[PDB]
């Protein structure tokens, strides 16, 4: 990001924060962190928010299905699950037809 001017960075941050406001209506904690961090001069605040967000996601991993606490890691196993489950669904479909 060093190779872009501040205006672009500000635009991207605000654009992200918009969708964050739309999404965060679910959870009070992330909403509070957002409602505190959105001000400019409190970068650490946003960081905590990010931290919280990150940690919050780790609540939902269902380790049993995907066995590490890292969400971004989790994405790969989720996609692999999708692929294999499509395969298994095709199998079920053929079996049902017969």
């Amino acid at each position: 990001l060093a190779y872009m001017e501040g205006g672009a960075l500000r635009s991207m941050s605000d654009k992200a924060l918009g969708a964050l406001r739309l999404a965060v209506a679910d959870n009070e904690h992330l909403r509070d962190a957002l409602r505190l961090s959105e001000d400019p001069k409190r970068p650490e605040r946003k960081v905590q928010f990010f931290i919280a967000v990150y940690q919050h996601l780790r609540e939902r991993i269902r380790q049993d299905i995907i066995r590490t606490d890292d969400p971004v890691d989790a994405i790969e196993q989720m996609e692999i699950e999708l692929a294999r489950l499509t395969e298994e669904l095709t199998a079920r479909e053929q079996k049902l037809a017969i």
Binding site: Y3, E76, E79, I80, A83, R84
Partner: protein, 247 residues
């Protein structure tokens, strides 16, 4: 300096991406060739995983087919054999000893021999008129004479032996039947047999699921690498510009 600055963003994004893609692997890449060799390894791992998965699938298919073979209604199946129960009064021998004790079931099986799955019919001269119909029948079909309700034991040249029996079937012709484990007969522990088969099938399916997951993992990895070469290869392994810029 200006040239290197312009070049930089591409190279740094390329790094970030390779860094992630590679730590995903258990390896550090260093060369386009290195990447191709990794491709070869991935292909070998894939063509293995597929073979193991297919083997497990064959095992599961066999297990399911056999569980069916043990399923209904008494004996193996409802087919020509159960059909003879109404084509004539051909009650199934195995049903006729449905509640056989598990301990006699091996002796019963050994004695009844292949006729284990035979059918009791007070008259087999009576099956004669319909016999010409039976082209769609098990290649070799047993028929027995006696009252199925209170069928007297099929008279046999039976000689009981330790865990077996010897029977004069026809002249100059003897069959030796060893006692089978967990016999086929009836509903005594045949449901139990097929239940054990079901339990085994459960582990088979679990293993198959894991193998499929692994196969898809490998698919995804290769696809990522393929994308990562279609993009990004021009700049791969190119020097850091930042150090030169600072210098």
């Amino acid at each position: 300096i200006q040239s290197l600055t312009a070049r930089a963003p591409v190279w740094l994004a390329a790094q970030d991406t390779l860094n992630q893609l590679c730590e995903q692997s258990g390896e550090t890449l260093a060369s386009s060739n290195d990447v191709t060799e990794y491709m070869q390894q991935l292909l070998e791992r894939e063509r293995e995983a597929t073979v193991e998965r297919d083997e497990v699938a064959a095992q599961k298919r066999e297990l399911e087919k056999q569980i069916e073979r043990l399923s209904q209604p008494s004996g193996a199946e409802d087919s020509r054999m159960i059909a003879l129960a109404e084509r004539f009064g051909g009650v199934l021998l195995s049903e006729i000893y449905d509640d056989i004790t598990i301990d006699d079931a091996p002796y019963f099986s050994a004695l009844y021999g292949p006729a284990r799955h035979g059918i009791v019919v007070p008259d087999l001269s009576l099956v004669r008129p319909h016999l010409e119909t039976l082209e769609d029948c098990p290649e070799d079909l047993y028929l027995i004479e006696g009252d199925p309700q209170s069928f007297d034991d099929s008279v046999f040249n039976a000689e009981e032996q330790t865990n077996a029996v010897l029977v004069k079937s026809s002249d100059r012709q003897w069959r030796y039947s060893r006692y089978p484990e967990l016999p086929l007969f009836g509903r005594a522990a045949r449901e139990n047999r097929l239940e054990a088969l079901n339990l085994e099938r459960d582990a088979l399916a679990e293993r198959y699921a894991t193998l499929s997951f692994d196969v898809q993992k490998i698919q995804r990895a290769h696809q990522a690498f393929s994308q990562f070469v279609g993009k990004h290869l021009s700049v791969a392994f190119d020097t850091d510009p930042e150090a030169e810029i600072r210098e």
